[PDB]
Amino acid sequence: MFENITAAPADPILGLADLFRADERPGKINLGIGVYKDETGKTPVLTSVKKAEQYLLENETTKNYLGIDGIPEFGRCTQELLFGKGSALINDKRARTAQTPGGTGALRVAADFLAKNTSVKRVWVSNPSWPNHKSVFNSAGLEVREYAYYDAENHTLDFDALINSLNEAQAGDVVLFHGCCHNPTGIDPTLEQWQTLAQLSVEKGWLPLFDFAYQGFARGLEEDAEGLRAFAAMHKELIVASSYSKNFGLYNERVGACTLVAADSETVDRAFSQMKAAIRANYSNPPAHGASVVATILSNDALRAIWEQELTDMRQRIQRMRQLFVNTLQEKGANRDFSFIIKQNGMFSFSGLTKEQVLRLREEFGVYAVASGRVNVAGMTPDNMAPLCEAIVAVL
């Protein structure tokens, strides 16, 4: 029966990573997958995390199953991060949070939930966007439409095109938004634009779904959440999928959360029970380690202070690389202006290099980037910057 199966293509992202491991020539440079790297080019485990892990090793007395929705404290802490310590949504108990295996996992349970318990038939995602967004919703049988986002001429947010593009999104339609650090453009709406979108959203009857994979990598923890909070004060219902993979360096421990918000405590609880049924029929209950670490850090004032410092250093090193990248491009002889790179937020920068050029950099200079022209700025170091910039100039 397996002879009739047609092979699946390779992940445009995850795929690339196996080729890099395959590449034999010395000097290779990996600017693909979005993982943080320090000056030495390594993806270390944070000190705050090693601390928490030692604490768990000393005090865990059992590995007994967690509830379907995971660690209680985990949910409370994420709700504060997202909505604010004294949020009204929290005080009125309008939100429930389920611990999931990564942000991907939060997007999937949200999708299974919507497919089986609502009349939602369509989800609108931006173009471009993280490739896996479409695969996640399709797996639940939801049709996925796309709206305009990037102005490739001005390297800015094409707001007028975005608004017009969404004119055909109906009441009951789900509309996906990147909380901050849009992947892959790096362009986020301003507070004013968010507020406008918030208003248009209510008037149109959309169900907002926020994907928050980089809280803290743009301006800061509180700042990066302004868009969402402007939506939260305007909406009755909304969903948010968050990930702690990047801001805690916990990638392989799959720590994330899916937060449900309804009009009142009674409705959200009723809806949440169904979200749990969807989880039960998927993986039954969430992996404890990663979430234990995060909850331990967010709850301890000493660990928390350390972690915040580590996130700040991660954020600043990336911005520093953005500057050094643009400067070195000039010094190496690039006539194309790359100034826009400094205005982008987060790990990824939309270089604007053509698929052809990307393939040339890979097979001819040993430099890897996603075929969309997206390049990981977090992967740039003082040591590979020159070789990197020199290659790009060559393909220009």
Place this chain on the structure above:
Amino acid sequence: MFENITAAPADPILGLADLFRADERPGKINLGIGVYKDETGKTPVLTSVKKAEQYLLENETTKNYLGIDGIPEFGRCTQELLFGKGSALINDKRARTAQTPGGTGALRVAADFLAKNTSVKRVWVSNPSWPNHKSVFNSAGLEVREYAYYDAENHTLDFDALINSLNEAQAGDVVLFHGCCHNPTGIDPTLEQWQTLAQLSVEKGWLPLFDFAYQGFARGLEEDAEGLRAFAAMHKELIVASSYSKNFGLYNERVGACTLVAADSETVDRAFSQMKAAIRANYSNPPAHGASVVATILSNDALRAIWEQELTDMRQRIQRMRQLFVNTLQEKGANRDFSFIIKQNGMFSFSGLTKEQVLRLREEFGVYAVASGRVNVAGMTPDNMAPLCEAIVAVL
């Protein structure tokens, strides 16, 4: 959008745990969830596990993503346990293993794999069986059919009712088999019966799906895989969803595996690519901590030894309670023969109690068991045995 969602009923197994946790009677007895407990009534972390976590804590340099199918060694180690060191399935490179979030996760990925890449429409599940088996498969769009299995009156396997029922399984249909320690009956087929089912399986043309959640709790590692190894040596294709939750006591770390077997190496690889695609659109990549622990224990001879020793102590402590349970029931005045409980395998026992009796046990004596009358022998200790048997006799 959420106003009309109808609440979900509690999970027949997990729901119980929440009621038990809430019950204020100081003498409560939990015999529901299938979790192990030592002579003192606690669910400890194995010593082998604790040692591995220590190694991990002091040697992990990064938390970088694992890759869709997980830790490679992990995959190789589970294939030898399932098939045997020198299996031909391994040599001919006919099997592909993907690390999944628990056995439940292994069941869902397999279900999504089948429904999205083949013609499979129906799934055959023993009657009775683990309640969540239907939820998992129905969620992937697969229809679920049940086949006779248990002889109520004789408290045995109705091999005649079984084979007559399965005569209705058309070719291409999927038939679920519990590797060993059937849930909830505890009655497994003898090798002879496995032999038969295997040959009849190839004749009727079914795709065998094995749920292996208790390797090591019936007789032993090798002994427990006998039925599977018999199917293996005879079929061209089969799927095995296994769990490390129990035999490693890693319940909340979600450690499982989904193994695909095809006719040859090119076919399994082609089919395995779609499985990875199914995974990518679910949780992206598996949780590293628990699987890492399993991998390091199984790879280190000095740790393996300790682990097998610990597994044996658990299997033996459960046999001693099964006997003690039957002896005590007579002593406290039972007007019946529960001798049929010594023939059952694993952690559970199909007591014979009715829903109403199971209910009274909870309501009046604070003794918790599954409504189907399933009881966790592994939750019985020398200390709670007496109170426990008095309650049953009283409701008898």
